[PDB]
Design a protein around this ligand. Structure first.
Ligand SMILES: Cc1cc2nc3c(=O)[nH]c(=O)nc-3n(C[C@H](O)[C@H](O)[C@H](O)COP(=O)(O)O)c2cc1C
Length: 138
């Protein structure tokens, strides 16, 4: 499997690592890829797209890298299963509510409730691992 993410301080990166850990513990392989190193064609080949990005300016996806990545794949993912996650700070998930609506609008099947964790996982480390296990069970 593959996990593609953007992280500015490492919070979402840690989430990605824990999600990967859960998938691996379930017995499957998974590569964790920073959005800046993503290979679109190899990504679109996956049965499930696991995408993560923290909440950025005014509750939006990160603008310089993650956003353009989503835009580029937006027309090639109808019918594709996707799982969304990310870390946030002072808000309550507005950027993720919008991210989910967005992918649904592209025709994606959002397979799990999006995983949102405040700041560094910490107490939520197991929740991250479990989200990965849910995805692996599909
Ligand atoms: C410029 C900027 C804007 C942010 N905007 C939001 C926001 O609108 N809502 C929110 O809950 N957190 C917001 N945050 C907080 C980050 O989402 C939070 O610190 C998160 O843990 C960062 O994860 P990352 O290290 O993976 O980037 C913002 C942070 C930065 C740097």
């Amino acid at each position: 499997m593959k996990i593609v993410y953007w992280s500015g301080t490492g919070n979402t990166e840690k989430m990605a690592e824990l999600i990967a850990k859960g998938i691996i513990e379930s017995g499957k392989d998974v590569n964790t890829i920073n959005v800046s190193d993503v290979n679109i064609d190899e990504l679109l080949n996956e049965d499930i797209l696991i995408l993560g990005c923290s909440a950025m300016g005014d509750e939006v996806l990160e603008e310089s890298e993650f956003e353009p990545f989503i835009e580029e794949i937006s027309t090639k993912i109808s019918g594709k299963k996707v799982a969304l996650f990310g870390s946030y700070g002072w808000g309550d998930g507005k950027w993720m509510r919008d991210f989910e609506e967005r992918m649904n609008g592209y025709g994606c099947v959002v397979v799990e409730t999006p995983l949102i964790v405040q700041n560094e996982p910490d107490e939520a480390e197991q929740d991250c691992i479990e989200f990965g296990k849910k995805i692996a069970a599909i």
